[PDB]
Amino acid sequence: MQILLANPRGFCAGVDRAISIVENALAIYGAPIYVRHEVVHNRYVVDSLRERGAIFIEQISEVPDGAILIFSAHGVSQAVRNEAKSRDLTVFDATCPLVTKVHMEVARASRRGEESILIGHAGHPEVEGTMGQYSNPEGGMYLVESPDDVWKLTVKNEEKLSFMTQTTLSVDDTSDVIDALRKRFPKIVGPRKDDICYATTNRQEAVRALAEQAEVVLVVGSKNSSNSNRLAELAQRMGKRAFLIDDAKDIQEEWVKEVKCVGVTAGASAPDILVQNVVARLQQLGGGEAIPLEGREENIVFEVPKELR
Numbered sequence: 001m002q003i004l005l006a007n008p009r010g011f012c013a014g015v016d017r018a019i020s021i022v023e024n025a026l027a028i029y030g031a032p033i034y035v036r037h038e039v040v041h042n043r044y045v046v047d048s049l050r051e052r053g054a055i056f057i058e059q060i061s062e063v064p065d066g067a068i069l070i071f072s073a074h075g076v077s078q079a080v081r082n083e084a085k086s087r088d089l090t091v092f093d094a095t096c097p098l099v100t101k102v103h104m105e106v107a108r109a110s111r112r113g114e115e116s117i118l119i120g121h122a123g124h125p126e127v128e129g130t131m132g133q134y135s136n137p138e139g140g141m142y143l144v145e146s147p148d149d150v151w152k153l154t155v156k157n158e159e160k161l162s163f164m165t166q167t168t169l170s171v172d173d174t175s176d177v178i179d180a181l182r183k184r185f186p187k188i189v190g191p192r193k194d195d196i197c198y199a200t201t202n203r204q205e206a207v208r209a210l211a212e213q214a215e216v217v218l219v220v221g222s223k224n225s226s227n228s229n230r231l232a233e234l235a236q237r238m239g240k241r242a243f244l245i246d247d248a249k250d251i252q253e254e255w256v257k258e259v260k261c262v263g264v265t266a267g268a269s270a271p272d273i274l275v276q277n278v279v280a281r282l283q284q285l286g287g288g289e290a291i292p293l294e295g296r297e298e299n300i301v302f303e304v305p306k307e308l309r
């Protein structure tokens with residue numbers, strides 16, 4: 001059985017920064033360090049950090065006065081940041097710079113009292129945080145997930161309307177939502193294409209190339225990671241069996257019995273050691289040396305804040 005590796009796969013710049021922010025806070029201040037939400041949606045990263053003294057919370061009312069709190073890579077609403085800001089908390093912000101870019105646009109629209117539409121998945125922490133930058137009652141902030149959501153939306157003033165997106169969506173499905181937005185609201189203003197980040201776009205391009213060669217695709221990533229779910233979905237729509245797995249123990253022998261070419265990729269939040277262990281298991285199941293596909297080069301790094309060097 002041949003094993004192919006997607007390229008790029010695995011950690012993006014935002015995830016490497018966010019994990020380093022927690023690790024470095026632990027090293028400088030000691031345990032406990034509180035983190036608002038899983039720093040990234042990866043069960044191995046979050047358990048690793050817990051075992052070193054990070055405490056993951058959903059609400060600020062879970063954090064003691066005077067504590068160090070880090071916001072996760074997904075970002076937080078103004079209400080959350082003010083709830084921390086009003087309390088005693090030393091805050092470090094691990095929000096990805098590519099989410100912060102979107103938040104600055106929503107904040108600009110709110111200050112103008114002009115309505116904004118976000119494309120994104122309801123209940124996702126990044127959507128909470130981005131919707132949560134809009135505060136002006138004179139405008140409005142609306143969420144859409146699909147063309148049908150666009151077809152039913154009504155707004156106060158469609159001559160003064162803009163759109164933003166979540167960073168970890170399907171490039172293809174998002175393109176269809178944007179086409180519906182522009183047909184419904186021909187004066188709508190937005191980015192050239194979407195706010196989907198380089199890492200999401202590149203891993204989807206890479207898994208497409210992988211799925212063109214591989215009969216089965218394994219995506220290393222956790223169930224609650226949107227970008228990792230998009231990679232599995234994309235291979236499945238190409239007609240390949242694709243499985244989202246947290247680690248090598250999840251691999252069922254039937255999925256690769258008789259398969260001549262298995263492909264492996266990993267979401268932006270999944271560490272490379274997980275992929276190495278998956279490759280080791282596929283080898284026990286008859287695979288050979290893993291062959292990385294040629295891929296688009298990535299060269300972006302985001303540094304930790306100077307406070308945490």
Ligand SMILES: CC(=O)CCCOP(=O)(O)OP(=O)(O)O
Binds near residue numbers: 015040075096225226
């Ligand atoms: C800022 C982000 O939304 C991406 C963070 C890294 O990936 P992950 O934590 O898996 O988040 P998603 O659920 O958005 O893919």
Ligand code: F3S
Binds near residue numbers: 167227
């Ligand atoms: S928004 Fe940032 S955290 Fe990663 S998946 Fe994209 S570079």
